[PDB]
RNA sequence: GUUCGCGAAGUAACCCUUCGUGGACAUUUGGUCAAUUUGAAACAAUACAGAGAUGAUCAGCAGUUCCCCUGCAUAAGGAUGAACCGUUUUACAAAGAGAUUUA
């Protein structure tokens, strides 16, 4: 809806949460298109959430196993950092998918005691409460950064943008308030006219 | 809301629009109350809009801890033994489903058939008598009137029996250090220093 | 200010009869009509079991400005369109005033802003102001194409027949119909004569008049109805040859009818505009033939 | 009472009979928020309405009469009222007794609700203006309303004649063959409003006609509010009736004063 | 009339304030009085100096 | 509707429908008004006016051809 | 519909059924919003041009504006984002000479 809105056509979004174009853009609209970090990271989200739905939809659908089930959300949880890539828009997740590899290691090493390598480990417990606790942070700030989108969508962006000053544009401002006060202290040493 | 092409879903849409910010708390409420892997299905109580923008789970997932710990201990059991005697583990497929292909209805689809059975460990009957009628329930005694306050499930209180039953099953991931000499040099005082 | 704002200025005959009257105040609301600036919507209801909900269109500064309700937008006092308030104060001051309201976006947004009144809101808000001006409205109520080729036309219109009983006849034809005396004006005065009111739901009756001719004619169905036509009718003219012609009489007016004694149609009157109007300047010279 | 108070109103579509609510297709891909075709060329995107009103036909009680609905059916006036009898707004030709219970309501808004505009669209059609009464309609698009057929000069005018006679009480009609236009100025502004809806998108064809198979394919007639009359000799009329309207409202003010005092 | 004004309950998920936009709107200026600019008269005299 | 990679076309007996060359026919007037427009310049160059005279000249026995057919 | 009374009929023997009649219980939803053309998104395509300080080639950073666009943004980018590159007469006097007037 929110890609309709902004009258973006040429971008499909998939149903499994993948953002395309449906044709070579001109440059324009490249720029038209060019969404933020909110919406991505709202989109993976999404994609994160579908991704862990969908195994009960495969469990349920009697595809899957109950213990193909409780491996395949450990497996979710575990390659986020390749099954998503919410790391290109809130890069300190790269704590969260490094705490679940971490976790990983201490969850192997005492399940595959006399045991040997395979697939089929579902203690998804330890790797759950990571993403709950970074799902906890994150909806102040989706929340800030969402609400922004959407208000700018209604109602357009504010006429009083008022730059701050910056690394960038110190010597243009500071030649603007220094010939200000040559020309005051000028003016007030003439005498008239 | 599946095909918003009338007049009168324009107010509608906007009720989908504003409730982007809104999401990350209705992926977290959704993904806490997930199913644990002894449980074929799970009925969580939710709130949703009128116009169908968002489904919040009203819910939180409030547990027994040594009953909720004997249940994980239980399915790490009936999960090492799984991996020990399958002949092969065939790891799902990510994603599960085409980006193409919609998330099929719940109802058409998933609703007429029988479950599957969930990760269960057989319970051996002279050795967890007080715990096997109802440890892989969804909310452990939640009617019995005496273990727990009532179904608001809160401030619980077990027998001797029952509680010593719930010790033996979490043998596998209990403390098993029972001396405050072992964390001499390791304790988090040790840590801060 | 946006923590103090004038109340709404609202008629009477908007809220209606009842006492008290629930209303909804949602701070900004729509969108002024004039001004196109937010502003606090009021809207509410007559009765509690109505179905109409009454909303405030316009601003209180928009409301202020013309001196008018922001529901109807009728003016607070005397309850009278803008239009024709500034209208009759123009026939009082004899100079024209007029509120005058931009096209422009910028300049409906700048307009509201200022704390003037637009047109006759001088006048009215000032209730010394209005009833003085009401007392000179009392005063003035104390004074209280010769090249066409016409020919192929004027021998399908009667004009050299009678109008007796005798004839049983549908249709008729209606000349000197002035460029005033509306369509529906000929219809009312023909079924209150006959009593056949409510004539649209039967369809007794079609009428075609063209306002350019100056002629017309009225079809009759169920041809007994000519007859009461015919005899419903007292007054009638002779020309000085002959040929009596009756009169229809709206007010003022005079219509004179001959039975066509065919369905004339559309286009018998012309098929052009400037063909039409030779039409109306041959008639003037017969009207002054049966006449005078 | 006898064509409209004696029977009930009556379904004129049926709900599966109505038109689907996307347009037709003059893109590559269809926009879901504003509910239009997107990566498109162009359109003329004007069709004939597949329905019409039969005046005395279609006309009944409905339930809006019984609960006193001051406003008329919309789609009604088009033809394609799905509801009938359960519809909550009226369904029949405004009459005298329907304009007066409108009097207090007309000044801002038509007689089916809708919310009139400070000043007019560009292209003189939509709902309306607030800021004048007009009660004349511009009859345009009469060339792809007939479907191109010669038909003459008077006949077009007749037809014209003929369809906006049963919408209400007409003050005059006036027909240009050299600009292809008409102009039909009712009564009451409430038939003007009944009448532009009615008939806008509509056809001529009159059925015994030839063409009547292929009144779908044309482009329909346009019906958009008309502007002040050039002439002076309908310049006069128009302060004249100014005139008239001024010196029946200082009667009615004088009175106000005279209870005032 | 005696009218009683309440409020609306919004929608948490419709956009409050509907009628708010960001848009600009230039001002006119309200100007009853002249300000006098109340200046003392004229050590006038300047040579070329400046 | 499109027809932009159709010429203007020079020949006219491959469309047979009159209703097509409806179409066709204002896709002539329209270079008629661009062209035409293009005619008055302040610089009034002799070249530019001389090509856009032969154009002129073209398309006015085009029109010829048309009101000779019918 | 329920409940508390009251009266009558039948079965009864003061209980049940039936229908007459008083109470009590419960008491004003919803819309700023109607379903394709006529009350308003926007791109794309076609045609015509075609990137500031220049002698040529390359970085930019600002400012003024009743232009904004992306973006979470007070970051940054939008060609240094664009527009800017035109049109320009009276706060006017003081001195010194030849022609044309006036009465
Ligand atoms: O190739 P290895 O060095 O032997 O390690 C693999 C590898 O994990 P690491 O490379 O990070 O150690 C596998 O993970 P993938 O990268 O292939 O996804 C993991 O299993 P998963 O694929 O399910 O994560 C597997 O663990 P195991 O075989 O015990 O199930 C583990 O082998 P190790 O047991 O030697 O760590
Ligand atoms: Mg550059
Ligand atoms: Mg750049
Ligand atoms: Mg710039
Ligand atoms: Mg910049
Ligand atoms: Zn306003
Ligand atoms: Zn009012
Ligand atoms: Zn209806």
């Not at chain 2, 596998?172 to 040099?185: A, G, I, M, Q, S």
């Not at chain 3, 005899?231 to 012609?245: A, D, F, Q």
């Not at chain 4, 009615?198 to 006609?209: C, E, F, H, R």
């Amino acid at each position: 809806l929110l890609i309709h809105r902004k009258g973006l056509t040429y971008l499909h979004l998939d149903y499994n949460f993948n953002l395309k174009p449906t044709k070579t853009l001109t440059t324009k609209e490249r720029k038209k298109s060019r969404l933020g970090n909110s919406f991505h990271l709202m989109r993976e989200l999404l994609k994160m959430m579908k991704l862990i739905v969908d195994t009960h939809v495969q469990f349920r659908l009697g595809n899957v196993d109950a213990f193909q089930l409780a491996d395949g959300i450990h497996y979710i949880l575990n390659h986020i950092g390749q099954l998503t890539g919410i790391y290109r828009y809130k890069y300190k997740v790269m704590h969260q998918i490094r705490a679940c590899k971490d976790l990983k290691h201490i969850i192997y090493y005492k399940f595959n005691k006399n045991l040997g390598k395979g697939p089929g480990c579902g203690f998804w417990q330890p790797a759950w409460r990571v993403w709950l606790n970074f799902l906890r942070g994150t909806i102040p700030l989706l929340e800030r950064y969402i609400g922004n989108l959407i208000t700018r969508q209604f109602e357009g962006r504010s006429n009083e943008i008022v730059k701050t000053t910056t690394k960038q544009r110190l010597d243009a401002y500071y030649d603007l308030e220094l010939r200000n006060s040559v020309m005051d202290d000028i003016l007030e040493m003439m005498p008239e006219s | 809301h599946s095909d918003m092409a009338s007049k009168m879903y324009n107010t509608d849409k906007k009720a989908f629009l504003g409730a982007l910010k809104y999401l990350p708390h209705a992926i977290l409420k959704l993904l806490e109350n997930m199913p644990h892997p002894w449980e074929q299905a799970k009925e969580v109580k939710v709130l949703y809009h009128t116009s169908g923008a968002i489904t919040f789970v009203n819910e939180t997932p409030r547990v027994i801890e040594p009953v909720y710990t004997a249940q994980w201990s239980a399915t790490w059991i009936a999960m090492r033994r799984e991996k020990r005697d399958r002949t092969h583990f065939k790891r799902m497929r990510f994603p599960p489903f085409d980006d193409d292909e919609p998330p099929l209805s719940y109802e058409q689809h998933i609703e007429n058939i029988e479950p599957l059975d969930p990760i269960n460990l057989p319970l051996d009957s002279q050795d967890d008598e007080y715990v096997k009628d109802w440890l892989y329930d969804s909310r452990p005694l939640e009617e019995d009137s005496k273990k727990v306050n009532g179904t608001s499930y809160k401030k619980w209180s077990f027998d001797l029996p029952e509680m010593s039953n719930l010790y033996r099953l979490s043998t596998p991931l209990r403390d098993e250090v029972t001396d405050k000499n072992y964390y001499y040099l390791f304790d988090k005082k040790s840590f801060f220093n | 200010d946006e923590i103090n704002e004038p109340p709404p200025n609202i008629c009477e005959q908007c809220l209606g009869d009842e006492a008290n009257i629930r209303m909804t105040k949602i701070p900004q609301g729509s969108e002024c009509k004039i001004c196109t600036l937010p502003f606090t919507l009021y809207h509410f209801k007559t009765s509690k079991r109505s179905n109409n909900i009454i909303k405030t269109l316009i601003c209180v500064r928009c409301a202020t400005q013309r001196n008018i309700c922001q529901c109807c937008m009728l003016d607070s006092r005397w309850h009278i369109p803008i239009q024709l308030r500034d209208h009759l104060i123009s026939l009082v001051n004899e100079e024209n005033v007029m509120t005058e309201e931009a096209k422009n976006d910028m300049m409906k947004r700048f307009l509201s802003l200022k704390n003037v009144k637009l047109g006759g809101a001088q006048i009215t808000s000032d209730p010394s102001e209005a009833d003085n001006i009401v007392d000179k409205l009392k005063n003035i109520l104390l004074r209280a194409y010769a090249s066409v080729d016409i020919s192929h036309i004027l021998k399908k219109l009667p004009l050299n027949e009678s109008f007796l009983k005798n004839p049983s006849t549908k249709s008729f034809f209606l000349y000197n119909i002035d460029a005033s005396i509306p369509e529906w004006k000929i219809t009312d005065t023909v079924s209150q004569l006959l009593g056949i009111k409510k004539w649209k739901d039967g369809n007794s009756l079609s009428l075609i008049v063209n306002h350019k001719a100056k002629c017309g004619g009225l079809r009759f169905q169920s041809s007994e109805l000519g007859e009461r036509f015919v005899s419903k009718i007292s007054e009638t003219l002779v020309t000085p040859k002959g040929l009596k012609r009756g009169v229809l009489l709206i007010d003022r007016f005079r219509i004179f009818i001959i039975p066509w004694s065919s369905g004339f149609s559309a286009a018998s009157f012309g098929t052009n505009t400037a063909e039409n109007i030779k039409l109306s300047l041959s008639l003037n010279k017969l009207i002054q033939l049966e006449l005078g | 009472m006898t064509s409209w108070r004696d029977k009930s109103a009556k379904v004129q579509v049926k709900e599966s009979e109505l038109p689907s609510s996307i347009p037709a297709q003059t893109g590559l891909t269809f926009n879901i928020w504003y509910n239009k075709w997107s990566q498109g060329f162009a359109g003329n995107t004007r069709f004939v309405s597949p329905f019409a009103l039969q005046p005395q036909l279609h006309s009944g009680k409905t339930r809006g009469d019984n609960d006193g609905q001051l406003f008329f059916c919309l789609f009604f006036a088009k033809g394609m009222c799905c509801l009938g009898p359960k519809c909550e707004y009226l369904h029949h030709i405004p009459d005298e007794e329907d304009i007066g219970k409108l009097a207090l309501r007309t000044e801002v808004l038509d007689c089916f609700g809708r919310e009139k505009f400070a000043d007019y669209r560009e292209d003189m059609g939509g709902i309306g203006s607030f800021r004048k009464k007009n009660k004349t309609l511009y009859v345009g698009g009469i060339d792809g309303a007939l479907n191109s057929k010669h038909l003459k000069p008077a006949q077009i005018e007749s037809r014209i004649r003929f369809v906006f006679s049963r919408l209400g009480d007409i003050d005059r009609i006036r027909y240009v063959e050299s600009k292809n236009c008409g102009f039909v100025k009712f009564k009451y502004q409430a038939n003007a409003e009944f009448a532009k809806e009615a008939m806008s998108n509509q056809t001529l064809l009159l059925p015994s006609d030839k063409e009547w198979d292929d009144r779908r394919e044309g482009t329909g007639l346009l019906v958009k509010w008309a502007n002040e009359d050039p002439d002076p000799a309908a310049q006069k009329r128009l302060q004249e009736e100014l005139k008239l309207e001024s010196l029946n409202m200082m009667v009615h003010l004088i009175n106000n004063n005279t209870n005032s005092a | 009339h005696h009218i009683e004004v309440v409020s609306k309950q919004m929608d948490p998920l419709l956009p409050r304030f509907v009628g708010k936009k960001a848009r600009k709107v230039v001002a006119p200026t309200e100007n009853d009085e002249v300000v006098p600019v109340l200046h003392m008269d004229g050590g006038e005299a300047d040579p070329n100096e400046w | 509707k499109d027809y932009s990679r159709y010429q203007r076309p020079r020949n006219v007996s491959k469309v047979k429908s009159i209703k097509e060359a409806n179409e066709w026919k204002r896709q002539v007037s329209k270079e008629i008004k661009q062209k035409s427009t293009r005619i008055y310049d302040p610089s009034l160059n002799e070249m530019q006016i001389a090509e856009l005279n032969d154009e002129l000249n073209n398309l006015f026995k085009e029109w010829k051809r048309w009101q000779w057919h019918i």
